[PDB]
Each structure stands twice: as C-alpha cells, then as structure tokens.
Design an enzyme around this catalytic site. Sequence first.
Site, PDB file in Angstrom:
ATOM      1  N   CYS D  54       0.794  -1.221   0.000  1.00  0.00           N
ATOM      2  CA  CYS D  54       0.000   0.000   0.000  1.00  0.00           C
ATOM      3  C   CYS D  54       0.831   1.278   0.000  1.00  0.00           C
ATOM      4  N   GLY D  58       0.961   0.608  -3.928  1.00  0.00           N
ATOM      5  CA  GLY D  58      -0.458   0.347  -3.846  1.00  0.00           C
ATOM      6  C   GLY D  58      -1.285   1.592  -3.606  1.00  0.00           C
ATOM      7  N   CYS D  59      -2.130   1.540  -2.585  1.00  0.00           N
ATOM      8  CA  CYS D  59      -3.018   2.649  -2.255  1.00  0.00           C
ATOM      9  C   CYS D  59      -2.455   4.064  -2.447  1.00  0.00           C
ATOM     10  N   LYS D  62      -1.031   5.133  -6.150  1.00  0.00           N
ATOM     11  CA  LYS D  62      -2.181   5.019  -7.041  1.00  0.00           C
ATOM     12  C   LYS D  62      -3.208   6.138  -6.834  1.00  0.00           C
ATOM     13  N   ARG D 161       0.889 -11.239 -10.037  1.00  0.00           N
ATOM     14  CA  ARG D 161       0.903 -12.530 -10.716  1.00  0.00           C
ATOM     15  C   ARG D 161       1.150 -12.313 -12.211  1.00  0.00           C
ATOM     16  N   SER D 194      -9.299  -6.149 -12.832  1.00  0.00           N
ATOM     17  CA  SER D 194      -9.390  -6.006 -11.392  1.00  0.00           C
ATOM     18  C   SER D 194      -9.447  -4.505 -11.087  1.00  0.00           C
ATOM     19  N   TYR D 195      -9.580  -4.125  -9.825  1.00  0.00           N
ATOM     20  CA  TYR D 195      -9.637  -2.692  -9.546  1.00  0.00           C
ATOM     21  C   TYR D 195      -8.302  -2.008  -9.840  1.00  0.00           C
ATOM     22  N   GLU D 199      -8.191   1.185 -12.203  1.00  0.00           N
ATOM     23  CA  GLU D 199      -7.745   2.427 -11.586  1.00  0.00           C
ATOM     24  C   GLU D 199      -6.524   2.939 -12.318  1.00  0.00           C
ATOM     25  N   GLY D 287      -4.067 -10.114 -10.925  1.00  0.00           N
ATOM     26  CA  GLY D 287      -4.147 -10.787  -9.647  1.00  0.00           C
ATOM     27  C   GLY D 287      -2.811 -10.823  -8.941  1.00  0.00           C
ATOM     28  N   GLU D 336      -9.037  -8.308   1.702  1.00  0.00           N
ATOM     29  CA  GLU D 336      -7.709  -7.877   1.294  1.00  0.00           C
ATOM     30  C   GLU D 336      -7.565  -6.378   1.092  1.00  0.00           C
ATOM     31  N   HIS D 467     -27.181  20.011   1.981  1.00  0.00           N
ATOM     32  CA  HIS D 467     -27.307  20.612   0.650  1.00  0.00           C
ATOM     33  C   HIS D 467     -26.321  21.767   0.570  1.00  0.00           C
ATOM     34  N   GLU D 472     -26.181  13.701  -0.216  1.00  0.00           N
ATOM     35  CA  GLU D 472     -27.584  13.888   0.174  1.00  0.00           C
ATOM     36  C   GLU D 472     -28.577  13.089  -0.668  1.00  0.00           C
TER      37      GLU D 472
HETATM   38  C1  LIG Z   1     -26.328  33.312   0.970  1.00  0.00           C
HETATM   39  C2  LIG Z   1     -27.137  32.107   1.463  1.00  0.00           C
HETATM   40  C3  LIG Z   1     -26.539  30.855   1.407  1.00  0.00           C
HETATM   41  C4  LIG Z   1     -27.220  29.670   1.840  1.00  0.00           C
HETATM   42  N1  LIG Z   1     -26.571  28.449   1.757  1.00  0.00           N
HETATM   43  C5  LIG Z   1     -27.260  27.288   2.185  1.00  0.00           C
HETATM   44  C6  LIG Z   1     -26.605  26.036   2.094  1.00  0.00           C
HETATM   45  O1  LIG Z   1     -25.444  25.880   1.659  1.00  0.00           O
HETATM   46  N2  LIG Z   1     -27.349  24.928   2.528  1.00  0.00           N
HETATM   47  C7  LIG Z   1     -28.664  24.987   3.035  1.00  0.00           C
HETATM   48  O2  LIG Z   1     -29.215  23.906   3.389  1.00  0.00           O
HETATM   49  N3  LIG Z   1     -29.295  26.208   3.122  1.00  0.00           N
HETATM   50  C8  LIG Z   1     -28.608  27.341   2.704  1.00  0.00           C
HETATM   51  N4  LIG Z   1     -29.270  28.572   2.796  1.00  0.00           N
HETATM   52  C9  LIG Z   1     -30.659  28.622   3.334  1.00  0.00           C
HETATM   53  C10 LIG Z   1     -31.728  28.066   2.385  1.00  0.00           C
HETATM   54  O3  LIG Z   1     -31.639  28.781   1.148  1.00  0.00           O
HETATM   55  C11 LIG Z   1     -33.100  28.206   3.051  1.00  0.00           C
HETATM   56  O4  LIG Z   1     -33.085  27.471   4.280  1.00  0.00           O
HETATM   57  C12 LIG Z   1     -34.277  27.662   2.190  1.00  0.00           C
HETATM   58  O5  LIG Z   1     -34.314  28.363   0.935  1.00  0.00           O
HETATM   59  C13 LIG Z   1     -35.574  27.870   2.960  1.00  0.00           C
HETATM   60  O6  LIG Z   1     -36.702  27.357   2.247  1.00  0.00           O
HETATM   61  P1  LIG Z   1     -38.139  28.040   2.362  1.00  0.00           P
HETATM   62  O7  LIG Z   1     -39.030  27.217   1.544  1.00  0.00           O
HETATM   63  O8  LIG Z   1     -38.479  28.216   3.803  1.00  0.00           O
HETATM   64  O9  LIG Z   1     -38.013  29.527   1.730  1.00  0.00           O
HETATM   65  P2  LIG Z   1     -37.335  30.186   0.438  1.00  0.00           P
HETATM   66  O10 LIG Z   1     -36.623  29.128  -0.356  1.00  0.00           O
HETATM   67  O11 LIG Z   1     -36.579  31.397   0.891  1.00  0.00           O
HETATM   68  O12 LIG Z   1     -38.585  30.580  -0.455  1.00  0.00           O
HETATM   69  C14 LIG Z   1     -39.578  31.555  -0.126  1.00  0.00           C
HETATM   70  C15 LIG Z   1     -40.196  31.955  -1.456  1.00  0.00           C
HETATM   71  O13 LIG Z   1     -41.515  32.533  -1.227  1.00  0.00           O
HETATM   72  C16 LIG Z   1     -41.560  33.815  -1.872  1.00  0.00           C
HETATM   73  N5  LIG Z   1     -42.524  34.636  -1.160  1.00  0.00           N
HETATM   74  C17 LIG Z   1     -42.385  35.318   0.019  1.00  0.00           C
HETATM   75  N6  LIG Z   1     -43.468  35.969   0.393  1.00  0.00           N
HETATM   76  C18 LIG Z   1     -44.384  35.694  -0.622  1.00  0.00           C
HETATM   77  C19 LIG Z   1     -45.754  36.098  -0.828  1.00  0.00           C
HETATM   78  N7  LIG Z   1     -46.398  36.884   0.040  1.00  0.00           N
HETATM   79  N8  LIG Z   1     -46.394  35.651  -1.948  1.00  0.00           N
HETATM   80  C20 LIG Z   1     -45.713  34.843  -2.822  1.00  0.00           C
HETATM   81  N9  LIG Z   1     -44.445  34.408  -2.733  1.00  0.00           N
HETATM   82  C21 LIG Z   1     -43.827  34.894  -1.563  1.00  0.00           C
HETATM   83  C22 LIG Z   1     -40.124  34.297  -1.886  1.00  0.00           C
HETATM   84  O14 LIG Z   1     -39.883  35.423  -2.688  1.00  0.00           O
HETATM   85  C23 LIG Z   1     -39.411  33.016  -2.265  1.00  0.00           C
HETATM   86  O15 LIG Z   1     -39.386  32.775  -3.663  1.00  0.00           O
HETATM   87  C24 LIG Z   1     -28.585  29.785   2.359  1.00  0.00           C
HETATM   88  C25 LIG Z   1     -29.168  31.062   2.406  1.00  0.00           C
HETATM   89  C26 LIG Z   1     -28.460  32.245   1.962  1.00  0.00           C
HETATM   90  C27 LIG Z   1     -29.179  33.576   2.051  1.00  0.00           C
HETATM   91  C1  LIG Z   2      -1.953  -1.317  -7.001  1.00  0.00           C
HETATM   92  C2  LIG Z   2      -2.620  -1.591  -5.647  1.00  0.00           C
HETATM   93  C3  LIG Z   2      -3.507  -0.645  -5.157  1.00  0.00           C
HETATM   94  C4  LIG Z   2      -4.172  -0.802  -3.897  1.00  0.00           C
HETATM   95  N1  LIG Z   2      -5.046   0.200  -3.445  1.00  0.00           N
HETATM   96  C5  LIG Z   2      -5.676   0.031  -2.185  1.00  0.00           C
HETATM   97  C6  LIG Z   2      -6.553   1.056  -1.691  1.00  0.00           C
HETATM   98  O1  LIG Z   2      -6.831   2.129  -2.291  1.00  0.00           O
HETATM   99  N2  LIG Z   2      -7.119   0.810  -0.428  1.00  0.00           N
HETATM  100  C7  LIG Z   2      -6.886  -0.338   0.348  1.00  0.00           C
HETATM  101  O2  LIG Z   2      -7.465  -0.411   1.461  1.00  0.00           O
HETATM  102  N3  LIG Z   2      -6.039  -1.327  -0.138  1.00  0.00           N
HETATM  103  C8  LIG Z   2      -5.443  -1.144  -1.377  1.00  0.00           C
HETATM  104  N4  LIG Z   2      -4.572  -2.151  -1.842  1.00  0.00           N
HETATM  105  C9  LIG Z   2      -4.330  -3.350  -1.019  1.00  0.00           C
HETATM  106  C10 LIG Z   2      -3.379  -3.114   0.151  1.00  0.00           C
HETATM  107  O3  LIG Z   2      -2.138  -2.602  -0.355  1.00  0.00           O
HETATM  108  C11 LIG Z   2      -3.201  -4.428   0.897  1.00  0.00           C
HETATM  109  O4  LIG Z   2      -4.493  -4.858   1.355  1.00  0.00           O
HETATM  110  C12 LIG Z   2      -2.273  -4.305   2.129  1.00  0.00           C
HETATM  111  O5  LIG Z   2      -0.979  -3.845   1.711  1.00  0.00           O
HETATM  112  C13 LIG Z   2      -2.150  -5.656   2.787  1.00  0.00           C
HETATM  113  O6  LIG Z   2      -1.355  -5.562   3.977  1.00  0.00           O
HETATM  114  P1  LIG Z   2      -0.396  -6.738   4.439  1.00  0.00           P
HETATM  115  O7  LIG Z   2       0.173  -6.301   5.730  1.00  0.00           O
HETATM  116  O8  LIG Z   2      -1.175  -8.027   4.360  1.00  0.00           O
HETATM  117  O9  LIG Z   2       0.795  -6.864   3.353  1.00  0.00           O
HETATM  118  P2  LIG Z   2       1.764  -5.889   2.530  1.00  0.00           P
HETATM  119  O10 LIG Z   2       1.463  -4.462   2.827  1.00  0.00           O
HETATM  120  O11 LIG Z   2       1.767  -6.355   1.111  1.00  0.00           O
HETATM  121  O12 LIG Z   2       3.144  -6.154   3.233  1.00  0.00           O
HETATM  122  C14 LIG Z   2       3.856  -7.398   3.229  1.00  0.00           C
HETATM  123  C15 LIG Z   2       5.301  -7.010   3.485  1.00  0.00           C
HETATM  124  O13 LIG Z   2       6.069  -8.183   3.870  1.00  0.00           O
HETATM  125  C16 LIG Z   2       7.227  -8.278   3.049  1.00  0.00           C
HETATM  126  N5  LIG Z   2       7.560  -9.697   3.009  1.00  0.00           N
HETATM  127  C17 LIG Z   2       7.050 -10.690   2.221  1.00  0.00           C
HETATM  128  N6  LIG Z   2       7.571 -11.880   2.445  1.00  0.00           N
HETATM  129  C18 LIG Z   2       8.495 -11.652   3.455  1.00  0.00           C
HETATM  130  C19 LIG Z   2       9.406 -12.532   4.163  1.00  0.00           C
HETATM  131  N7  LIG Z   2       9.477 -13.839   3.900  1.00  0.00           N
HETATM  132  N8  LIG Z   2      10.206 -11.988   5.124  1.00  0.00           N
HETATM  133  C20 LIG Z   2      10.114 -10.649   5.381  1.00  0.00           C
HETATM  134  N9  LIG Z   2       9.304  -9.738   4.792  1.00  0.00           N
HETATM  135  C21 LIG Z   2       8.498 -10.339   3.804  1.00  0.00           C
HETATM  136  C22 LIG Z   2       6.835  -7.575   1.747  1.00  0.00           C
HETATM  137  O14 LIG Z   2       7.894  -7.291   0.866  1.00  0.00           O
HETATM  138  C23 LIG Z   2       6.050  -6.382   2.294  1.00  0.00           C
HETATM  139  O15 LIG Z   2       6.853  -5.256   2.648  1.00  0.00           O
HETATM  140  C24 LIG Z   2      -3.910  -1.997  -3.118  1.00  0.00           C
HETATM  141  C25 LIG Z   2      -3.007  -2.947  -3.631  1.00  0.00           C
HETATM  142  C26 LIG Z   2      -2.345  -2.767  -4.900  1.00  0.00           C
HETATM  143  C27 LIG Z   2      -1.386  -3.847  -5.363  1.00  0.00           C
END
Ligand SMILES: Cc1cc2nc3c(=O)[nH]c(=O)nc-3n(C[C@H](O)[C@H](O)[C@H](O)COP(=O)(O)OP(=O)(O)OC[C@H]3O[C@@H](n4cnc5c(N)ncnc54)[C@H](O)[C@@H]3O)c2cc1C
Ligand SMILES: Cc1cc2nc3c(=O)[nH]c(=O)nc-3n(C[C@H](O)[C@H](O)[C@H](O)COP(=O)(O)OP(=O)(O)OC[C@H]3O[C@@H](n4cnc5c(N)ncnc54)[C@H](O)[C@@H]3O)c2cc1C
Lengths: 105, 105, 494, 494
Positions: D54, D58-59, D62, D161, D194-195, D199, D287, D336, D467, D472
């Site tokens: 890894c 490996g991990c 990669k 292998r 394989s993966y 990858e 493998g 593994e 959101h 989500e």
């Molecule tokens: C800058 C900013 C960033 C935000 N970022 C996030 C975020 O990342 N994640 C998140 O979950 N929330 C975020 N929010 C909050 C989210 O937008 C609100 O929680 C959500 O829109 C509320 O839903 P609502 O239905 O209560 O009202 P709103 O979506 O505000 O809708 C009310 C609607 O009713 C209309 N309306 C009002 N009075 C009347 C009326 N008398 N007659 C007819 N229509 C009317 C309005 O003009 C509007 O179109 C953010 C807010 C702001 C200001």
């Molecule tokens: C290309 C690739 C990508 C991978 N990507 C991921 C990933 O994204 N996420 C994930 O969770 N896993 C991933 N894996 C798998 C991960 O690397 C293995 O699951 C992990 O290394 C296994 O741990 P281990 O301790 O069994 O053996 P290893 O980490 O293989 O270690 C065995 C060690 O023992 C040594 N050894 C062998 N025989 C002897 C001996 N007789 N005497 C002394 N030392 C010896 C070796 O040379 C080595 O250093 C990937 C593997 C490969 C090949």
Amino acid sequence: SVKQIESKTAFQEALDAAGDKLVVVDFSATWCGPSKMIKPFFHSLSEKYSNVIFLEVDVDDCQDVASECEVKSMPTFQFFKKGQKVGEFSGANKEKLEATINELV
Amino acid sequence: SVKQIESKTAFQEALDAAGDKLVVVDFSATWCGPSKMIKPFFHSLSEKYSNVIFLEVDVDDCQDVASECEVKSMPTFQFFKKGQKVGEFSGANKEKLEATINELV
Amino acid sequence: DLPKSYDYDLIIIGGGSGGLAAAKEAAQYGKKVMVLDFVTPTPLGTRWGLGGTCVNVGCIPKKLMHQAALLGQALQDSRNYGWKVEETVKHDWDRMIEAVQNHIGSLNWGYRVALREKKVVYENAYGQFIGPHRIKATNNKGKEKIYSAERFLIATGERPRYLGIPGDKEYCISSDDLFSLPYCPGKTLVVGASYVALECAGFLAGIGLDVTVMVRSILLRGFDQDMANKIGEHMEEHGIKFIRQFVPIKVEQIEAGTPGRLRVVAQSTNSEEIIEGEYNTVMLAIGRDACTRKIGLETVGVKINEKTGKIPVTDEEQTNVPYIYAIGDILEDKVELTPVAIQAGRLLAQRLYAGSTVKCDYENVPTTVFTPLEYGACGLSEEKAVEKFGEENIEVYHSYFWPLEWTIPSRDNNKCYAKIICNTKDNERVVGFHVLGPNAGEVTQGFAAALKCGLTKKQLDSTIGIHPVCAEVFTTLSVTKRSGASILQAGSCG
Amino acid sequence: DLPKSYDYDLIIIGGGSGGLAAAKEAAQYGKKVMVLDFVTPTPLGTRWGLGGTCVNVGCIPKKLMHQAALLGQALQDSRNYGWKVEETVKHDWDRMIEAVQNHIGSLNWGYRVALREKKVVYENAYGQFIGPHRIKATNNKGKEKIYSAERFLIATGERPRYLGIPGDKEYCISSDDLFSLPYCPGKTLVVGASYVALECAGFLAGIGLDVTVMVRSILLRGFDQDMANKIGEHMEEHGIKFIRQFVPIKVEQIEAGTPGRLRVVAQSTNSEEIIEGEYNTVMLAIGRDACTRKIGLETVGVKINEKTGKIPVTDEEQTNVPYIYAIGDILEDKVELTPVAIQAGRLLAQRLYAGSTVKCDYENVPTTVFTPLEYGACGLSEEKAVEKFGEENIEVYHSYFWPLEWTIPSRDNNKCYAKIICNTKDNERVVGFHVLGPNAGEVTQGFAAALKCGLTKKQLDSTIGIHPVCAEVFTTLSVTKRSGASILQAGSCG
Ligand SMILES: Cc1cc2nc3c(=O)[nH]c(=O)nc-3n(C[C@H](O)[C@H](O)[C@H](O)COP(=O)(O)OP(=O)(O)OC[C@H]3O[C@@H](n4cnc5c(N)ncnc54)[C@H](O)[C@@H]3O)c2cc1C
Ligand SMILES: Cc1cc2nc3c(=O)[nH]c(=O)nc-3n(C[C@H](O)[C@H](O)[C@H](O)COP(=O)(O)OP(=O)(O)OC[C@H]3O[C@@H](n4cnc5c(N)ncnc54)[C@H](O)[C@@H]3O)c2cc1C
C-alpha cells in the site's frame, strides 16, 4: 426577420394574425448553450423563407407561452397552422429545422 | 568539499581521521524538501570553511548510522569534537548552521 | 364569508424550497394545487426567478463560487503533480457570474416545467390572505385577484436584514445582490459572522479579492465554538483580514462606480472608539427576517411571534388555524436549511393526502459551512454536550489529519481536524460529530445517518475505514481531550 | 529442542500494513518485538523501502496518480468558472513520479522512526522458518541469522501474478514497477479487469495517455456488476479502449526503449481468433499471489491452502499452530484491504497483550475503487442480495445525480449513480450501499458506520441531507428498480 414576441397575449396575437401561413416558433433561453448556438441560423432562415412567419419566444421573458406549450428542453421549435400546433421538435439541429419548415410549407 | 560517508565504518573512520578538527554532519534525504533546499548552502559552506570537515549522511543509504546517531528529522546537523558530539540541531536554517559551525570551530 | 367551492385543494404561498417540494407531493395525489411565488426586489432593484433563496441567492450560487475558489487552489496543486500551469492565473468575475446565472436560469425553468408536469398551477404574484380561506394575489403590473382554497401553506422564507444605519440600503449589497453582481466587487468588507458572511468572504478571497470581515462578537454563534475559531483562524492565515468587536454606524459613498469607493465608519462594541476604512463593496451578512408580516395573517387569525417574526407550529407544521400550515425558514425554533424545508413539505403532503403519520424529524440535522476549509457537523457541539449531560460524562475524541491530496503540494498539515462527542453514561453514544476538511459535507452525510441509528464509540471503532480517504480518521479515534495528549502530527521530513 | 531463552516475545514476518500496525500495538505494552521486512525485487529489478504494498506500490501512489488525473480535469473545469486557464496544458510524467516517490520516502522514514520510537527491532531481511519458534533471516548481502520468539506473526502480503507466457516477465511491467517508472509509459495496454487494472488505466488516460484494457471475462469480479459495467461504460465513454474476451498468449519486443515498442499477440477466450497490437508499455494486472510458499511453514507445521496459497485461521487470526498467527492479504476468505490488515493486527496485539476479547469484524467492510468516476460500496451487491434473501424480498432504491460542481463546466449529467439494497423481510434493512461519483470514499465511510448500526430505509429517510452535497441523494431515495420508473436528471438546457 424574426419577431421577438414579448407577451403571452402577443403570442396568441401572433398566431391568430398568421392565418393559414405556417408560423415557426423558436423557444429559446440565453442560458442554454445549444439554444444560443442555433439562434443565428434561425434568424438567417427567416431572411430566406419570407413566406413563413418566424417568432422567437424567450422562455424567461414569456414564462407563459413556453409553459402553456408543454415545452421541456431548449431549443424547441414549434410550427403552428391556423393557431394549431402542426409540428414540433426539440434540439439544436438546423438541418431538421429547415427540413421541417419545407415539410409544413 | 563534502564527504559522502556511506558506512558506519567509513563514519567512525571520518570521525577519527579528523583529529581535533570540527566535523559537521548533514543528515539528509533526497525526498526531503528542506533537506534539498539546504544541501547547496551546506556544500558551498564546506568550501568556505576549509578549516572544518563537512560530512553528508543519507538516512536511506546509511540507515544504521542515522538510527545510531538517533536522527528523527531532516535536515539534522550533528557536530563532533575528537569523535564526540558537541553540536546539534534540526532544521534548514543556514544562519544557525553557519553560526553553529563558527561557535564550535 | 366562505366560498361555495374552493378553486383549489391547497394554495401555497411561496415557491421556494419547501413550497415547491410541498406542491409536487400534493399534486402527486391528484390534488388541485396552486403555488404563488413572487420576488420583491432588493433595495438596489435586484430580482430573480422561481426556485427560492437557495436556488437563486443561496446554496447553489454560493457553492458554485466556493467551487470556483477551490479550483483556483487546484490550479496551484496541479503543478506539483506534473501539470505545467502558469505561476499566477487570473480570474474573471463576469465570466463566473455568467456561468452561475446561466445555471440558475436552467433551474428556474426546471421548476416551472416540473410544476406543470404535475399540473400544478403557478402564478408569479405576491399572495396575501384577506379573509377565511381567501387570498389576494398581485402581479408585476399591480393586477390583483382573489382565490380560495380548502387549505393553505405558508412557505415565504426570509430576506437579508439591514443595519438601519445611514447609507446601508443605498450603497451596501447583501447576498441577494452578490450572486448576480454586474461587476467585480474589488476590495470588499463583509459585515457579519454568520455562515453566509464567512462562506462569501472565503470564496471572494479565494478568487483573488482583498477581503475583510467586521464582526460584532463571536463567529458562527450556534456552532461548536472551537471549530468556529479554527475556521476563523484558517481564514485569517489565508489572507482574509478580521476586524473584531466593531459594527458599522454609517456608510458613505466616496465615489460611485462599477465598483465605486465607499467609506465605512464603524464603532467599537466596548467603547466609543471609531474606525474608518475605504472599500469598493460592502456586504451585509447580519441575519435574515421572516416574511410573515405583510401577508395578511391577521385577517385569518394565524398567530406568530411578534418579536422574531417566526411562526409557531405543531409537530406537523400546523399553525393555530386548522387549515393553515407553515414550513421552511419561517418556522419558530426549527432548522433553517433547504433539505429541511423539502422534507417537511413532502411529508406534510403525504400526511394530508396519502394517509401518512410520519413527521419531519428536526433532531440532529447535519450541516456544512462551505468556508475555505469546509466544516461539517451533526449533533451537539462540545459546549452544548457538557451542558446537557455534564462535563464529567463527556469524552471528546479528536485528531488532526492531513489529506493525502495535500502532501504533494506540501501544504496545510495539522489544519484539518476531526472530533466526536461521546456520552459516557451507558454506552459512549456519539452525540456530536464535527469535521474540518475537504468535502466536509460528503464526509458528514453518512455519519448523520449513523447518529440516526444511535452510533456508539464501540460501533464506530468496529467500523473499518476506507484508505486513503479523509473520512477514515473517524474509525480510529483514540486520543481524548481529557488526556491532554498530543494529536499534533509531525511533518514530511519527520 | 527449544531455545532456553527466546530472543523475542513476538517476531513479525513482513513490515507491511498489518505487520507494522501489529508491531506498534504489541510494543505499546512493553513487549519485545522485531519486524522482519524485505522486498524481493520485481523481475526488472524494482524494489522499495519499508511500509509494504500500500505504502510503496499500492493505495498511496495510485491515489496520488489518480489525484493527478483529477487535477487535469480541474484545470479544464476551471476555465468555465472564470480562471483564464490555457485550453491545453501538458502533463509531465517524470515530475509526477518524482513527487510521488518523494512522498513514499517520507513514509518509509516515518515507519523506521516510529518503530525505533516504540523500541521495536527492525531488520531489513527475508524471514524463513527453520524449526519450532526459530527463524532464519537473510539480508541483502546474504548474511543469515537465526532468531527465536515466543510468538510469530505472518504478514507477508502478496505480489503481482504473471501470465506465464513468452515475454511477460522481460517486457511487461506490473503495478510494482509502474509507480516508479523511469519514463512515461506512452501508448499502453493494461491486461486485466481487477480494480488495480481499471484504476491504473484510468489515471494513465487521465494524464493524456493512449490506453487500452484487455479483459478475459467480467470487470471487477466480486463487485456489484451493474456498477462495474457503469464504470467500464464511463471509462470507454472517456477514451479508454477495451478489448473483451481476449488474453495475451505472447509478448514480443519490436524495439527496446524508454518507452520502447512492444507487440502483443492475444487469442480469444472462446475461439481461435488471434489479434495483435503495438504498444509502448504492457502492464499486467491479473491478480496477486500469497507470499506463503518460501518461508518454511513446513518446518513449523502451519498448514495453508496449497492451491490458493492462502492461510486458514481462526476468528482470532491464529493458524493451526498455537504460537503462530497470520493477518493481512494472505488470510483465507477475508478482506484484502489495508485498513483491514491494520485493524486485525492492532486487535491481535490487544487480545494477546492487553486482555481484550474484541475480534476484527470482516463483515460489511466498505471499499472504494478509484476509477475516473469513483465507486464506493459497502454491504451486499444487488445480485448477491437476491441470492441471500430472495428476489421478491429485495427492494432496490436508486437515482442518478449531478454534482453541482459539474453544472458550470456543463458535463456528465446522468452519470453519477446511487443505489441501496433493502431487505423487505421485517424492516427494509439497508444490506447494500453503492455509489458512483466524486469523493465516493468520503461519501461511503459514514454510511459503512450506519450499516454497522443496522440502518433501515425508514431511518435513512428520516435523516436530513446536507445541501448542496452529492451524498444527500441517499436521504431522499424513492424510486425502486421494481417500479421501472425513470431516474434521469434535467440537463443544462433541461
Ligand atoms: C447566501 C445564502 C446561502 C445559503 N446556503 C445554504 C446552504 O449551503 N445549505 C442549506 O441547506 N441552506 C442554505 N441557505 C438557506 C436556504 O436557502 C433556506 O433554508 C431555504 O431556501 C428555505 O426554504 P423556504 O421554503 O423556507 O423559503 P425560500 O426558499 O426562501 O422561499 C420563499 C419563497 O416565497 C416567496 N414569497 C415570500 N413571500 C411571498 C408572498 N407573500 N407571496 C408569494 N411568494 C412569496 C419568496 O420570494 C421566495 O421565492 C442559504 C441562504 C443564503 C441567504
Ligand atoms: C496497485 C494496488 C492498489 C491498492 N489500493 C488500495 C486502496 O486504495 N485501499 C486499500 O485499502 N487497499 C489497497 N490495496 C491493497 C493493500 O495494499 C493491501 O491490502 C495491504 O498492503 C495488505 O497488507 P499486508 O500487511 O497483508 O501486506 P503488505 O502491505 O503487502 O506487506 C507485506 C510485506 O512483507 C514483506 N515480506 C514478504 N515476504 C516476506 C518474508 N518472507 N520476510 C520478510 N518480509 C516479507 C513484503 O515485501 C512487504 O513489505 C492496493 C493494492 C495494490 C497492489
């Protein structure tokens, strides 16, 4: 030239004013890439097909029209005949557009 | 010039062959940034002080000398007198290094 | 006094997070619904489309700008990984705003399409009760209209609060205006210490801007304070300047522009001392007020908290009036988050028209503050845990961690921090979860579900971690704060 | 017969993930321990330091190269967020390898220092049992030495292998060699599914290389197959070329180099059809074999599975011989993964020298495949769930999601996928969790803890989402596969 209809009342006013002539509607949005890409061609096609009525309905400006017409994605081109939907398709495909015009004109 | 000691025997041999002269050892690693940053100054400093003996010990190549000198970090500099440790600190602070050398000469 | 027939089974006032969610669920069961949504303009005239705060001036644009900030750091990190990028890359504010708004527009359109799909009537107008089961609705041209409904749902949300000082409404912007700002803010002063204030200050700085945060007292009141200070501390280390114990008393325009030059005059919280600074933009992030005072609740009898403006409800979101419910930010003593408003709305519709008895659970709702260094949390904060169970019954396991992604760029070791709050009494329940690091929200979600299942330290320790992933730090916590042992890991070269 | 006095209380054969973890825990309780670690060279002579697979091959490396691939995408994503980034930025293979190896070196050093800290004896030598409680150890210069110990721990891991075909060992590289490759691989052929294979193919392509994957049968055997195919589908959609139902029969060198030119001849798995292609590098990821056949187990009586080479143990990692335990990849029917080997080792030491009775739990161990589009999983796969509980008792809730971070760059909508497997029998237990998206590992960890607590669909749905965060999506799953309803998300234009 294209008619930038900007009114839910204007849209129905446009269709009813069209008559028998095929009306081509470009439902667009300034926030949709493909819609902006094809817009220039829709307008170049309105300068080519004078016999047909070209309208452009910005879905943001006329939340009405677009909504009433069951529009889902942009661009969306609808063809009206005597105020009746007689052709429709979504997509920024100009060939399909020009081709659909002839089909209905 | 700096002597790249590659053995525990070459090390004890450097310590003894230095006599009373101050000897500075730079414990380093090719993979350690601060170690690399300081390497140049250390080597250049060796040329500035011909009255001092500069040794470089790579912790991966001389793993035993490092554990025997009890090194946990790089850069780590250890100073010796007649074969005994009189100076020591960790870090790539050249001012401190050149200053420690001047305090032990 | 009451219609011989209602035009709808349910009328929703407010087309935001909760309202729109509510609308669709109800419709799903063939009910006749109408959503009234109107966006009264900010003082500078800014306005937006359907979707609510989160969609237009909240969660969405803010996380997007936050990502913009994160990508700036990515450009830097990519060099060490072998990518040949230039040393300093400029950032274009207008391009960002453009991309952000374009996405907001797709969302505005998205919601309008969804409502119709469910045959839900949408009316871009301000709704306001006039009498029992009756509401008035005014559009952009001042065209009023009356509607009646068997039931009503108040989901009006809130809007940015101002200081009520000379020049704040004419020269200062709020989050409502920031996300679509016509020009780069330039040197900026953020007034406030809420999550909005910090998140905004963070991404603005993240994109190269000169940022300052003026705070009345403490940071993130309501959140675990040790985390809050670590956040502030991190923001400070990364450029963001802080001015503590000061509040603006007056803002004056030195010169109008795009941006202009503003002069801020602020006074001390503990003295008469006064300080002034010059900035291009001044954002006020000091809280939000419920939109529950101009919708004729009096003409229908729904009582609200006159002081705070919040609306008191039963555990089913029903006001004091039988046919009127309320959800979202306006509720009193609830959780002001989008996902919350959605759950509440959806469940309300299911209880009312699907025979469900499940109530929204406002307990242990997770959250994430998207500051430069993200902060995810669920459950009780540390201080809050001692108060509830007693200092002697609380064990706090914590540890620092260093994201593997950061090792090659060689930055910020001993910054990311993890901690859980455990309740010794009985079986070391994990009553609190807190994380400071990358993708904090992705890390916190699953754990929120775990707290929902009653996760204990024993079960946590029995869970195997995923390597190499930040979140795994939580599966091997062994050092308590009580022991006073070190958790300060060493650097690359030891 | 037996040494009057044992040199050590515990001698660990293998200084890898489990061995090193084991060593430190034991020492922690004042026991005298010695870790024997030696890395026999790859056929091309590659070798590395202390830490294990890894840490060295490996991990760690990669995931770092995977991050390099991710950062390439970040550079692109950034242009759209407003960063004036060049359209095409070139990547430097050598700089990457350098940075990667530099980090591995700090880890190699960290371990040597940690062992010396716990007074653990580290001997860089190959261990081989010679008799009861006695072991021989040979170093780099062939210097043998005998040691005795009260107890022994086998933690030798495995190694890549080979195909056993003409030219594989002299011209092909394995993961053991890839992570420190002296030159850019160039046009590459990855053999395996394989993966490791996927990858590696993914990040290589991620950095601009021409990549092809030759597969014998199914992708990611052992993993949920729908997810696997979505992964392969995403890899192919993104330039990675696949060759199915083929296995190389002979590899030949057209011209030596750095990289050179290699010819690969492969036959079909169900016919006689033969195909050949030219590549610069050919990696075999087919493998790994347990390192349990050259360590004198016969001279001590420890029985292993002669066919697979795995070592059968009790639920406490004890072999058939009382004083000899084994952990890590070499165990039979276990998990593994690195974190697994660490838990097992740590717990073993605690049971043996701290009076603990807690056993390592190999049930529902989470995992993450770091392919271009990451895949996190915990619990039963779908197909595996029907087999265990019955097709009619399994409800599969799923949904697509579109990371907010991907909206402005406007890419890959309806790609990220989420699904849980629920057991209708009694309480709709979440017996399986699967996610395809960014930071899959950060997303899966908490949920693994939740499955540990017995999470049910009801509890999951009661949990509020964060959101706007990818994770989500799991708190609001309502569409089952059984209903056949659609799960596509709206795009940039809807
Ligand atoms: C800058 C900013 C960033 C935000 N970022 C996030 C975020 O990342 N994640 C998140 O979950 N929330 C975020 N929010 C909050 C989210 O937008 C609100 O929680 C959500 O829109 C509320 O839903 P609502 O239905 O209560 O009202 P709103 O979506 O505000 O809708 C009310 C609607 O009713 C209309 N309306 C009002 N009075 C009347 C009326 N008398 N007659 C007819 N229509 C009317 C309005 O003009 C509007 O179109 C953010 C807010 C702001 C200001
Ligand atoms: C290309 C690739 C990508 C991978 N990507 C991921 C990933 O994204 N996420 C994930 O969770 N896993 C991933 N894996 C798998 C991960 O690397 C293995 O699951 C992990 O290394 C296994 O741990 P281990 O301790 O069994 O053996 P290893 O980490 O293989 O270690 C065995 C060690 O023992 C040594 N050894 C062998 N025989 C002897 C001996 N007789 N005497 C002394 N030392 C010896 C070796 O040379 C080595 O250093 C990937 C593997 C490969 C090949």
